[PDB]
Amino acid sequence: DAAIKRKLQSFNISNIVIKSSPISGIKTAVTDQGILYVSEDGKYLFEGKLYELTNNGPVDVAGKILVDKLNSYKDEMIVYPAKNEKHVVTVFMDITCHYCHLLHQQLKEYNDLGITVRYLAFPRAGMNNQTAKQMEAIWTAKDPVFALNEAEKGNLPKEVKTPNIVKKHYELGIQFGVRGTPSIVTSTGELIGGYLKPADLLRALEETA
Amino acid sequence: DAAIKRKLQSFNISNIVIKSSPISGIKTAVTDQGILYVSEDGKYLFEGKLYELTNNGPVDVAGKILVDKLNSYKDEMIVYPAKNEKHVVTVFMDITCHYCHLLHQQLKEYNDLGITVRYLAFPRAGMNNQTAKQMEAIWTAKDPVFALNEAEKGNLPKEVKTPNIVKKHYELGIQFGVRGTPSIVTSTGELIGGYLKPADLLRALEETA
């Protein structure tokens, strides 16, 4: 991993970070230009996308590289655990979205189907508005569940913070390909992005192991 | 190379053809979906693009895989050799193009600068018109140089054939990224696509070794 990030610097490649590529001789170089792939040597770069069709289909190796990134935010997520979970899905949500709202009005149901809902923020209209500022407030509050539960009931925070964690959540969403909300990211890194009622959300999860 | 094209068939991948990838453990799989990269094993596919910045910059490995493809058409090219060549450039040309025309009116000059001009066809307005049919005729004639020399003087062939070799030349041009004519492809696989007077064409070639 040592003899590498040198030539990459000399190729305008930022925040270089090496890793376990499912292909020896190479290392999954999670750079600021994307999830690259480089030789132990460091003379060949893949600015493409590495897969493995396994059986279900063209499953991108970086899918799992990405999921770790997300999970690594666990303590920023606004969790709504279930009696005892059978599923743990992360949802990208926006406070001004009817379906995100609806999905929220059913945490009890999702919870009661053994699905733990974990929220990450996804301010659609960019980080430049009262709305993106309210979510920062909500996500960093003293008790996010209360803050969020109240925002969903119409009580937005009067004061407000500057987008930061919501920004980090946003950017991670794009990496996943979030193009609207709500968007449910499976615990196996998948992505059934879009609203899905309790029941339906269950099958979708059970069907795809 | 044996234990490979099996899973690839089982991933809707046509005209599979393995090859020398500058990276062991893998093989430059020139498929009908593009120049892929696969593991000796055959469980991992790169549907991306492999490079090597060397020194001049991000030189694509498939550049050389491609050039061989082109060169492999040598006996279809309409050549205009020079006393004794110092350069051998392949030009994608169209008969209804002012600059392709102009470039042609100077074969003597290019020739006299030690540059052998080799023409491949590139019918821009697709293979569906009198023009694409005339070039097929020209490229497959009994003496293409005469046929072409005459087409450039305004004497197009009366009869006409159905696009085929011009088609193969066309498709190879797109692979190279030809977006207009003329487009000069260097002997080192490069691509200074666009008109370039004799002199200028020389430097461009000499500068880049």
Residue pointed to by tokens 């097929």: B136
Q: Out of B41, B100, B112, B179, pick the active-site residue.
A: B100
CA A79 – CA B86 distance, rounded (Å):
71
Per the DSSP assignment, residues forming a β-bridge with B34 are B31
Q: Are residues A53 and A40 in the same domain?
A: no
Local structure of residue B136 (DSSP, 8 states): H
> Looking at the partner chain, which of A11, A23, A51 has a beta carbon nearest the beta carbon of B25?
A23
> Looking at the partner chain, which of B7, B45, B51 has a beta carbon nearest the beta carbon of A44?
B51
Q: Are residues B54 and B121 in the same domain?
A: yes
Q: Say whether B48 and A53 touch across the interface (CB within 8 A).
A: no
Q: Say whether A10 and B53 touch across the interface (CB within 8 A).
A: yes
Q: Are residues B135 and B184 in the same domain?
A: yes
Mutate to test the interface with A, among B7, B10, B47 (most CBs of A within 10 A): B47
CA B175 – CA B173 distance, rounded (Å):
5
- Residue A31: which CATH number? 3.10.450.70
For A68-83, give the secondary structure using H, E and C: HHHHCCHHHCEEECCC
| Residues of A in Cβ contact (< 8 Å) with B22 | 44
> Looking at the partner chain, which of B10, B23, B47 has a beta carbon nearest the beta carbon of A44?
B23
Closest C-alpha among B155, B157, B106 to residue B135: B157
Q: Are residues B57 and B91 in the same domain?
A: yes
Q: Are residues B42 and B4 in the same domain?
A: yes
| Residues of A in Cβ contact (< 8 Å) with B55 | none
Q: Say whether A23 and B26 touch across the interface (CB within 8 A).
A: yes
**Token duo for residue B150:** 């005459």
**Token duo for residue A29:** 């170089």
Residue of A nearest to B40 (CA): A23
Q: Are residues A31 and A94 in the same domain?
A: no
Q: Say whether A53 and B22 touch across the interface (CB within 8 A).
A: no
| Residues of A in Cβ contact (< 8 Å) with B59 | none
CB pairs under 8 A between A and B: 67
Residue A45: burial class (beta carbons within 10 Å; 0-12, 13-18, 19+): buried
Amino acid at B82: A
Residue pointed to by tokens 């005209």: B15
Domain containing A33 equals 1-48
- Residue A208: which CATH number? 3.40.30.10
Closest C-alpha among A46, A6, A41, A126 to residue B35: A46
CA B62 – CA B76 distance, rounded (Å):
22
Q: Are residues B26 and B84 in the same domain?
A: no
This structure's resolution (Å) is 2.5
Closest C-alpha among B175, B158, B160, B142 to residue B67: B175
Q: Which residues of B37-76 are buried (b: 16+ CB within 10 A; e: fewer)?
A: bbbeebebbbbbbbbbbeeeeebebbbebbbeebeeeeeb
Q: What are phi and psi of A148, to 5 degrees?
A: -70, -45
Residue pointed to by tokens 């490229």: B139
Q: Are residues A139 and A195 in the same domain?
A: yes
Q: Are residues A27 and A119 in the same domain?
A: no
Closest C-alpha among B53, B120, B115, B58 to residue B83: B115
Q: Are residues B154 and B136 in the same domain?
A: yes
| Residues of B in Cβ contact (< 8 Å) with A53 | 7, 10-11, 45
Q: Are residues A64 and A43 in the same domain?
A: no
- The tally of domains found in chain A comes to 2
- Residue B121 and residue B70 in contact, taking contact as beta carbons nearer than 8 Å: no
CA B118 – CA B131 distance, rounded (Å):
20
Q: Are residues A21 and A56 in the same domain?
A: no
CA A109 – CA B179 distance, rounded (Å):
57
CA B9 – CA B144 distance, rounded (Å):
40
Local structure of residue B50 (DSSP, 8 states): B
Amino acid at B39: S
Our CA-based measurement puts residue A28 at a distance from the nearest CA of chain B, in whole angstroms, of 13
- Residue A85 and residue A107 in contact, taking contact as beta carbons nearer than 8 Å: no
